[PDB]
Amino acid sequence: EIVLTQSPGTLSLSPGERATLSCRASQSVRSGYLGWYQQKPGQAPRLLIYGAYNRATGIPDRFRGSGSGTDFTLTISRLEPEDFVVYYCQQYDRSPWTFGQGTKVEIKRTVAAPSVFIFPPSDEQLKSGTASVVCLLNNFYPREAKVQWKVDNALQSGNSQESVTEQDSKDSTYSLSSTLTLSKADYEKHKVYACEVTHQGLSSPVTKSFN
Amino acid sequence: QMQLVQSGPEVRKPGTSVKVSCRASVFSFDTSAVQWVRQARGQPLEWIGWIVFGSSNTDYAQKFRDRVTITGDMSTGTAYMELSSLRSEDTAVYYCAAPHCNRTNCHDGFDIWGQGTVVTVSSTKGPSVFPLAPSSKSTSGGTAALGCLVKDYFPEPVTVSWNSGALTSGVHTFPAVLQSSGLYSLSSVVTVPSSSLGTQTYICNVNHKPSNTKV
Amino acid sequence: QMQLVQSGPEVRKPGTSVKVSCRASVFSFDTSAVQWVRQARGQPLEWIGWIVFGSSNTDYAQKFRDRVTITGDMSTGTAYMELSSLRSEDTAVYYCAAPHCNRTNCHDGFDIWGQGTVVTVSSTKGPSVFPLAPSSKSTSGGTAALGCLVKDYFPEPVTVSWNSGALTSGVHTFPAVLQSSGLYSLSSVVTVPSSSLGTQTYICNVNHKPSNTKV
Amino acid sequence: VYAWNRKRISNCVADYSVLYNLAPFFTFKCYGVSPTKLNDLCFTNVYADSFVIRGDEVRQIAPGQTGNIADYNYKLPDDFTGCVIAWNSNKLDSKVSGNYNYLYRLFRKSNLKPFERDISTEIYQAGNKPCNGVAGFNCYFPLRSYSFRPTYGVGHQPYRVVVLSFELLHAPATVCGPKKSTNLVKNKCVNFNFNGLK
């Protein structure tokens, strides 16, 4: 079966520019059964470009398709931000129909500094028989962070999960949370739960803890 | 507007028969087709799963064609899809798609899509809320943060509100994650000035539809 | 219901050609007529501007017939109106009117009217909101007042809401005025009791369609 | 049904009375002729068709009928004069575990004119792209089977219909009707009616 290998993974630009994304294949496919689609996170997918030469109804006159034979590309006329979503490609020419990985586009901005906010466990949570340490990381542009807990100068891992939100509609930032779920057997002994924050924008490693 | 109606969510046991339908009106022209594509949270599409009403010619993928089957019905114009041997890897959203076709010729691409069907296989528990009162050491002057933790819930029809709904800005609700046991856990924080603390006291409000529990 | 559809608003430069249409179905009887009347904000009507489809017989006013022209078309049933040499005195709403006529005889008065067309000739800028926090000297006991000032805006599709829309009484929005530069400026106040101050703090919400800016 | 045969029996009279009465008939209707007095007319040529249809498509082969069989496999004009002859074949056109030996055209560009047989095995395009001799999305196969099985309902019974098309054109007639005879009474003054003389 024919597979799709999308080369551009992440490509950030500025509103008012031109972006070029491509979705090639391994072998040579027929240039008469190609279809581009647009899917918004939290909605239903729709058709964007069918046949690689003709546009669909309702689509603005800015999505121009190019490429033939083995390599295809999609050009944007003007980057007016209203479709900052992940695009996909489909080759419905052979019997096995396959798709691509995904091309996400984000907004480019200056590197900001994340804010550190640690929260100790609650009394009701300890009375219920559980414990959790929360370290909040908000207002950071680069979506590449790493947090390593320091529990009594011991590097802990595995029992830790992180959740990242999407971009806002005011400044296009991100939010990072980390919960350290631990039982009372290890909470009555260990008391220092540091949150090591290592970010590209922060020159000095900020680390907050409590007792 | 030409649209395709799809069924809602459904919870099943680890291994049973599931039937998802997609009713439409264009399925009475002896030339229409409908595909069944699966998409997980973040993962791209998986397969095609197409069927042509009329001259039935089925064609599945390599991993498929061993535990899945798709049937057709032209009397009522409703499609069907059966998937047996359900294991802990089908937790995704199923979509429906069918191109607009006439009585003699069809189009050259998929135009109309469906709505979606969420299928989750797990147990059920009772929701609970734990306080997340702020600390006196995290305050740096005019910048505070607080929230509420909700865990032990199989369904997540949860909406975050503050001050009995009298707040719109400063809300940052984190998506839900799946723990090792099988229960979800969300997170929500709010950024309020430190000067407001100690004067106006408020709490957090949650909502769970399958249990009708609010704090 | 027999109605006459008219085009929407349009912004032009100081001096160009403008075309306003008024489509209807009664304009295919060789005896129907349609008038073009202009009415400013507060000022009464200005002229007649009528035209008879068929035997073309035009008749304008004294100020007109030198820079305006009206044509007709019976194939599609849509009227036209062209006005050249646009200066800073045509900022008004254009209305359409046509009496119901049969295929052999018409009525004896104008029955059906149109919708309206707003034409404004100016530049464009970016909206802005300035605070209008209350003063401690204007309070007389249970009688307070506050609002928000919005200036520097060419279009005015502005709606005033308070408490994120959770307020209906005590709203007094003043109409917009035209400054000497060319930018508009509105005013809106809200009457709340003085006892509510210092306990429940709220803000003001605005909306601008051509810019999509909300505070 | 898509490839119907045609026979031309002529040069002698019609004596359709030794057909063992065709015990299973299920359909006996004459459009423009009476079954009582039908051999009293001389015809030139008589045509007959042969095909097999299902149970839920028997009333489709008639003047003034639309559908997929009456427009893509066999169609009759509005000016037709004849009877209906058909029988059931559920005990012959059925084998063990399904019987797949009959085909029929389902997809076509336009409808077939009256008295038109098409045996083309070309692919049909339902879009705007060429098929290029390979099945895809906008190219299907217009031929499929019928899946005749003995364990079925009365709407699956196969009906072999023979369509008589009596014709009398501008030439010596040949399909007439049969005649009888009496004995030879001699020595008596009586009436005689020979072939041409009376």
Author numbering:
A (entry chain H): 1 to 211
B (entry chain I), C (entry chain E): 1 to 215
D (entry chain C): 350 to 547
What do the study's own words say?
In this study, we reported the isolation of potent and broadly neutralizing mAbs from a vaccinated donor with a special five-dose COVID-19 vaccination schedule.
S trimer was mixed with PW5-570 at a 1:1.2 molar ratio, incubated at 4 °C for 1 h, and further purified by gel filtration. Unsymmetrical trimer dimers cross-linked by crystallizable fragment (Fc) regions were observed in 2D classification. S trimers with 3 RBDs up, each binding to one PW5-570 fragment of antigen binding (Fab), were solved at 2.78 Å resolution. The Fc region is invisible in the final structure because of its flexibility. Structure analysis shows that the epitope of PW5-570 mostly overlaps with the RBM. Superposing the structures of the RBD/PW5-570 and RBD/ACE2 complexes showed extensive clashes between the antibody and the ACE2 receptor, suggesting that binding of PW5-570 to RBD produces steric hindrance and prevents S from binding to the receptor ACE2.
